[PDB]
Amino acid sequence: ASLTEIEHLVQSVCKSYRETCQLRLEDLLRQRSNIFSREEVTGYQRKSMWEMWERCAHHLTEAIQYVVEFAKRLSGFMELCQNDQIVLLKAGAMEVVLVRMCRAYNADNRTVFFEGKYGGMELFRALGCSELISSIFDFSHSLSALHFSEDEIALYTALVLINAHRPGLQEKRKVEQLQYNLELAFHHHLCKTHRQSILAKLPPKGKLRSLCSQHVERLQIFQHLHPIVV
Numbered sequence: 001a002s003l004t005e006i007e008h009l010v011q012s013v014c015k016s017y018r019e020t021c022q023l024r025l026e027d028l029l030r031q032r033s034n035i036f037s038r039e040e041v042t043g044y045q046r047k048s049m050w051e052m053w054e055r056c057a058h059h060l061t062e063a064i065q066y067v068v069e070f071a072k073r074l075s076g077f078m079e080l081c082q083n084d085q086i087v088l089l090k091a092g093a094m095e096v097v098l099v100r101m102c103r104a105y106n107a108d109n110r111t112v113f114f115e116g117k118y119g120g121m122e123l124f125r126a127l128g129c130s131e132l133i134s135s136i137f138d139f140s141h142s143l144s145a146l147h148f149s150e151d152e153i154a155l156y157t158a159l160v161l162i163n164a165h166r167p168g169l170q171e172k173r174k175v176e177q178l179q180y181n182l183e184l185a186f187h188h189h190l191c192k193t194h195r196q197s198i199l200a201k202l203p204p205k206g207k208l209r210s211l212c213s214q215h216v217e218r219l220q221i222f223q224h225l226h227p228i229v230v
């Protein structure tokens, strides 16, 4: 893999992320002053846990759909067998969402974009799972503070997804080769942008898995068997 191949692969992954990022970064940041009022917050707190889990699942499933599309545009991804595609997506899509969603987090007032406005962790009271939400907010606070560029998000989320250690993979060696090229690209690009300092600051990969797994443990009771097309 020449300089040209790596630098192509960078530009390419950043293309596919931009065409699938769901909400423009620009819009997210401008909407930061649009904050839920105390009345609006109380409205969400009073909702049943069934309705809140349903709404949140719906928004997560939409976010996953845009991640499927991102994966469908990674060159390498389609070359894999139907089984591994599904395996990487089942395991990975939600972890990508978690990373992506840090774009919708405002560290100044500890709020997240949700149904057209910004609100704090208190919006989600009715869900019951306060430890989890706090962990998600702490994680996002942490990721927020190192100012991931959009291309950094693209390169990083591509590696979140293209992970050769996922159990169930039938063509593991192929995923490794692809994981390896995405690593060269990420590192290459960090080098050119003088951003190599973020590497030691990234979360451990087991952290994404655990937050997303903890999530699904407290969601299992309300939602399972989600249709999600490829």
Ligand SMILES: CCS(=O)(=O)c1ccc(CC(=O)Nc2ccc(C(C)(C)C(=O)Nc3ccccc3)cc2)cc1
Pocket: 021, 022, 023, 024, 056, 059, 060, 063, 094, 097, 098, 100, 101, 102, 103, 104, 112, 113, 114, 115, 124, 133, 136, 211, 212, 215
């Ligand atoms: C993700 C792409 S994006 O364009 O940046 C974006 C699109 C749409 C939205 C609006 C939007 O769905 N907000 C939203 C949705 C859910 C949650 C909660 C309920 C806390 C949640 O469960 N978060 C979570 C995320 C990943 C993994 C596990 C849990 C909080 C906020 C926000 C950001």
